[PDB]
Design a protein around this ligand. Sequence first.
Ligand code: MG
Lengths: 178, 267, 99
Amino acid sequence: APKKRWYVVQAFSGFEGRVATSLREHIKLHNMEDLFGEVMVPTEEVVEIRGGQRRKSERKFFPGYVLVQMVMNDASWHLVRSVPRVMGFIGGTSDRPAPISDKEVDAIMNRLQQVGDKPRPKTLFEPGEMVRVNDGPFADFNGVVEEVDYEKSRLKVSVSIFGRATPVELDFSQVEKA
Amino acid sequence: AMHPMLNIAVRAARKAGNLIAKNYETPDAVEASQKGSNDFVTNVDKAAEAVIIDTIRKSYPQHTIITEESGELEGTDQDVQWVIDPLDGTTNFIKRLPHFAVSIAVRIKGRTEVAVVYDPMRNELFTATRGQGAQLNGYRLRGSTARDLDGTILATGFPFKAKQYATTYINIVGKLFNECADFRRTGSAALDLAYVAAGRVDGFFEIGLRPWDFAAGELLVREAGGIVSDFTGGHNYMLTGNIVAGNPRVVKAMLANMRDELSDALK
Amino acid sequence: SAAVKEFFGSSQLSQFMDQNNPLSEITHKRRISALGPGGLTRERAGFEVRDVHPTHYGRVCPIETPEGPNIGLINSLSVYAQTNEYGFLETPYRKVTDG
RNA sequence: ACUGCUCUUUAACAAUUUAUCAGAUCUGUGUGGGUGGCGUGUGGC
DNA sequence: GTTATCCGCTCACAATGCCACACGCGCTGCTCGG
DNA sequence: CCGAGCAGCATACATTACTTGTGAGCGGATAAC
Ligand SMILES: [Mg+2]
């Protein structure tokens, strides 16, 4: 029972998804829907719904690479390499590939599961950094993030109100640089 | 901008130093007790350490803390450490000698990232963050641009806890007095390191220093053009506690001069 | 467009016309070079190539050539000279019968 | 329909152990400050 | 067989000085943008 | 919905291209004990 161990191929700058599409099309060409079973390009989503970039942004686990679930045969080797725009394999010595190990496989699988379950706003704030305020009521203020929050997502922030410092609950959208 | 953890650390050090100054003008409130060799430790140490720990936990309830008194308080996390000395030169604060400082540095993955020392008597605030440098009250710090062991000033410390090396130490100093101009001795490792990074003294060296007595100054002298090492050119100074520091030329000259006078126990 | 325009505009061969004199214009239009893509360069030219070959008679002028680092590389095509159907340099000649 | 039935007359304090006799200066805006890097080609000598 | 010996194989590394003139100098489909 | 910036892309490939002359390190054949 030789399982189709996963493998990785080095794509170009920003053609990974297109490379995967064309690879599936080459599969449908050569009918190798068995050997080239799975092909995956992971991603992430940072959701900052205000302040320029609006409502979402797409990242990648690791750019330039594409993941496949091929097998090891010289024919399939070329069939992977005989696609529009890919560099060689990424693994052992060239012409003798090596598989991404099953431990790393399940690791990246869990990462993919976590990023697919919860679309979560990244580009967070770290406790103790100064920052301006783009809020209406508190326009052109600046204070230090006294305590950060993620699910509540409302940035307990100390700032000079009536003299002494006071903590406020200015939400993410009302937070400027850093 | 300003490094976040650096801002928290400098606020905490400011509060601790204000408490220090408050305890200073009252030669009555200090109620010390002897713990080591020819030095006390005061209640003020405990008060300042408490203030620092509390201010840190306010904005960081999980970071690991390190202190001469509380040893190592392992927070729920163990990659972000805060090495703290609420007082460097407690001997001086006993005699109310106005030369001491509070010291706070942060280690990430074992690498010191931010560091501050604070002299409340002159209101001097040596800050330093990795990859951005060291500042004295808003001025950059480049260390003494001296290029040789001539005319230099050498800050040092006498090992009042490990006086066995004294003789050897003496010889070292003696040898150094053949070339250097003058020495300096303030009984405050952190402020010695700062002055080195401040370009006020052109080199510092000490035999057997405590880990939390340089972990803040060492980043200062690093990002102020200077380098640090042990007495044999290696990086084990964090364990041996044997420190030399200063601009590369003077450090190289000192090491070349001391290669012989030193003892095999130290190397 | 990119290929054809980068060729006609920025070529090792194409260059602004030597248009300061009618004779200069002509001799720069009917000028034969040995450099360029697929052609040798002045560094690796070799003292052998530059010299006129006894077959240059009538097919390429032997007297006009820029003096200096590229002698014999740049050549002026003869007056009556004319390219062949394949691309060689055919020269006219008067047919002589028996006598 | 069916727990609830006065508790009795506005805050309840910190500073605190040598040492004391209280024990010279409110001026400016004189002055300057406010194309090029590389590559290639072409020629010339 | 091995140990030192030698001979062809492949790669690094140099190509006068100036002057003048000319020309050009990423991009591109993904990304930030309304 | 296309205009205005960007991030890492031999354009993906077969690009590519005779001698240049010289030294120098190197790997496969070679003489000897
Ligand atoms: Mg201490």
